[model samples]
Target chain A: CLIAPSILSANFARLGEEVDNVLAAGADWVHFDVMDNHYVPNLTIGPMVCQALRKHGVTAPIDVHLMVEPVDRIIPDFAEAGATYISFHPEASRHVHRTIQLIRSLGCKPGIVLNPATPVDILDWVLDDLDLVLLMSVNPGFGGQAFIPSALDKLKVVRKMIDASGKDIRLEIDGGVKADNIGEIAAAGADTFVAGSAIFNAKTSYQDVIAQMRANVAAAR
Target chain B: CLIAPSILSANFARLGEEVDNVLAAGADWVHFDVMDNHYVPNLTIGPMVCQALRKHGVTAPIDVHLMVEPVDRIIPDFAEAGATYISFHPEASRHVHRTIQLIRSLGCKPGIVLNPATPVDILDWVLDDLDLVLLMSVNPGFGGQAFIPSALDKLKVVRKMIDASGKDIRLEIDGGVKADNIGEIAAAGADTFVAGSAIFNAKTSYQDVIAQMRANVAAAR
Candidate 1:
């Protein structure tokens, strides 16, 4: 399991420097929060920022979580702009299979995301196409929302689906993943944890939080 | 027939002030671009920016264009952040119908976006559920790429579909939309135009660019 710190809480003015800090803190992949005001009540950066980040030498594989609808039309741009992994919601496009195919064609690891309210069954057929499955542990939109208790159960089912298919898909959880509960989530089968406010707002060092998270996961196993 | 000044090209430091200027410049709506790094290699501000703008007293309809994927989880956040219009890419989600339903449930006018390479037939069945359709005039990852020459032909086909369906879907075009091309796009049945670079990078004034664009569109009709 790798720790991908969500950059949503970082100060944009010093983002490049901050990314450097995250990398130095032993972050595995840089997690970017792409929100359209329509999709999540907020608006963020576009492809230019990613290109800028790549130019500045953030060499780790960027795990881009697309919180936007209709992802297929723009997946190629992200791939071209240098995203190594891309995940979209199963609820956004009608042709999930085709959309994932497009992402794969662009040389990216394609993944599917399931919002808490969204049923896990929607992704049943396309499980084989995914490199990952992001299960939103909290309701989407605002940061710092409480982790839903149901998320653990959801991960168990998704893990079963991944195991049954014999695919090497990673399971990620966003929203409310913290030092306290990360161990339990890993025990329940989530290998990736997205922490925004928990990591960024902490008075402690990001490196320590990441280390603790990894340690907890290892201990749980 | 609303004028939406896309701030995708605006300087981020004083976004609130710039948005105020656009509203005072007779803009009907403020268009914000949300790009996740994975969707297009750019990372922009999130729903928090919308909340900040709304707090700053820019009350015009905030039209959010999600150039990302899997837009379901983020829809509620945008609506709560005060966006009146939310649009996602057509190719990003598997359950397009459900995504639209979610957007509408969140009290946003649901929209679909098409990239340069996407054909008109791709949106055939889903046109009925959309309140707007945005056509990318340029490839979306970069900021100032030239408008693809073939977009005019594509818009004509999309217009026919919207008219045939008898849905009052507003047709919008992004990427390289300017005073020179707004007329042709409108004549081809597009009423809304999103100009990022043209409005923000004008040699004269951003207001002048927006006003001249409106005049050009009116003259075409």
Candidate 2:
């Protein structure tokens, strides 16, 4: 199991140090969220921030989650900016398969995101082309929110689909992931976990929280 | 004076070699034309092609011209794609000044593009913030069209505005530029010339035509 910390909840004033600190604290990947005002309610960082992170010497895989409409145009930018994995909400992209191909062509792992309300059946046809499958446990606009319980059922359905595919596709869970519930999420079939506030907002050290989350996943397994 | 050869006329099958050939032939900049089917009638290359050129090891300054509507979102993409200068039509952008600041903040030179019918007086207040002022000599979208005669007068008008501003802003002329008429276009106050068909469709070599065009511009000066 891999632990990915979302940088949305990190200190923006000291973003470089925040990213460095999280990576040093045993975070497996950097969950970079890109939110466009048109697609989502809030506007956030674009590819430049990802490039800055790479320039800051963070060599770990940077997973980019794009919450933007007309995503095909921006895929190349993030790939060029040193992103290792690039995923987007299917509803935002007009041609999902084409966007996936575009991302792979730029040498980044392509992923498809499932919102809390979006159906998992949409991935039936394109599951073979994807490298990662992201299931959002909360509405994606803001950082910290209560985890939706229905997502656990959705996770099982998608997990079964990924297992049947016979390919090495990674299953990632994002939003509202905490140390307490991580073991249940992992047992439900998420190999990659994304926690924002659970990691950045902890009163204790990031290392301690991440280590605890990892232990929970291992125990669940 | 600088010569930017439009890559729209290059053979797409071997774009890297085509870009190399132009730069090797004494072209000062690579003119990358981005067309979205919505903004214009045609859809051409996006940031990926620009990144491909950079990855192909073409080190010349890339002059990116965005022919897309609602241009603010794609600015950071091109800047990340190794573009040296990025220009967009003012009408396509709602807040033109904000777009200019966004481009500069990303570390790429910001420019404003004027269509044949766009008035030169639009740059009256924001002239000093511009690094380049591209004047379209023909209607955009399709290449190989004849240069509109009135654009020469508009060029002269913008030239005077740049001179009065006391800031070094490059005046570029694009569309329908040929060796026969390049002299008159340069004499009208354009320091940068963008020739697509003229250079690509030349009977002689790219080097010979670029040299001949340079000699003509020198004589006109």
Candidate 3:
């Protein structure tokens, strides 16, 4: 199990230090939010930012969640920039299957993202091929929203399906993931935890926050 | 009578040469297809290619079509990379109006793209703000597919709508456009022609092919 602190909430001017803080905090991976205004309500960093992060020696697997329209065009840019795992919102693309294949072709783990309202069944056909599944617990637009209670049931259902399907697909919960509920989420069968504000804004040091999150996940087992 | 040769069909290893050949052949712009693999089937170049083209001294306006999902993610990258114009597919994005706003915000001429099957009416709500509208003459994916005859009527409707809306939206036809059909397509109201294989794979030199395409448009007008 890996805990990834999403850099979406990190201070952009000091992104390198922010990433290093997370790394020192024992983050297994760092999540990069690539938002396009069409998919969400905001826009974030481009390929150069990812390239810079890579150049700065942030050795953790940079997981990029492309919350953008036209998911296919930017997947290669991220892969070429050295992303370990890439996920694109299904609602943002028409050629979802083809896009997944292209991501896999580029030697990156391909994952499909679903908004809260999107059905789990929409992904049933292609679940076997995905390296991971990201279920948005908060509405995509701006972060910091409270977790939608409905997403818990969705995660439960996804966990069951993943287990029944017998595929090595890890489930990741994004948006509003926090230390308070990290245990509940891990118990729901999510091996990967993505926290943005919770980690970045924690009163304790980032290292302490990461240790706490890891402990929470471990205790869930 | 500007001819923009799409590199969607050109050999990528020699993309710089392809741009040089097109520019030498009299292309006014080099259309770079940036597919993210989510919006379209393929994955193409990123800002590096655009930057590299500039380094190669191809000073023409680089028209970058973001045929990937969530079209807004790459606007800043494309603009930073020196693309003069940017376009995104409407089918893959939810916030078309905001997407256009972001593209313009990034200092590029914003264009809207529609698939051959997508109705021209999709632009009714956002036509006033667009600098260009790209009508796919064929289904987007692998290049060299024959033009879908249906796009002509869609272009006519779009042209009429643009006229009625009192906007200066340039009508660009992509996918299978060439000298043979430029006259008819222009007559039907397309102002810009994006010929990929038609220009890059012509028996004649690329320069002559571009010259013939411009001549065809001139003859049609």
Query: What are the iRMS values of all candidates?
Result: 6.3, 14.1, 11.3
lDDT of 3 by residue, B102-146 (tens): 889888899988987777777878888899989988877664689
Tell me the spans in candidate 3 whose CA falls farther than 4 Å from its real position: B1-221
* Candidate number achieving the greatest lDDT relative to the actual structure: 2
Report lDDT (Cα) of residue B103, candidate 1: 91
User: Model 2 segments beyond 4 Å from truth?
Assistant: B1-221
lDDT of each: 0.81, 0.86, 0.80
| Best prediction by DockQ | 1
> For model 2, how does the per-residue alpha-carbon lDDT over A1-221 read when each residue is reduced to its tens digit?
88889987775535667788998999999998876545665445666567767876889999999887878877887888899999999998888899999999999999999999998888979999999999999998854688998888888898899899998899999988999999999988899999998999899999999999999999999
Q: Kindly give the number of clashing pairs for every candidate.
A: 32, 0, 16
Poorest lDDT segment (10 consecutive residues) of candidate 1 chain B: B8-17
- For candidate 2, what is the interface RMSD? 14.1
Order candidates by DockQ, high to low. 1, 3, 2
CA lDDT, candidate 3, residue B59: 81
Question: Lowest-scoring 10 consecutive residues by lDDT in candidate 2 chain A?
Answer: A36-45
What does DockQ come to for candidate 3? 0.03
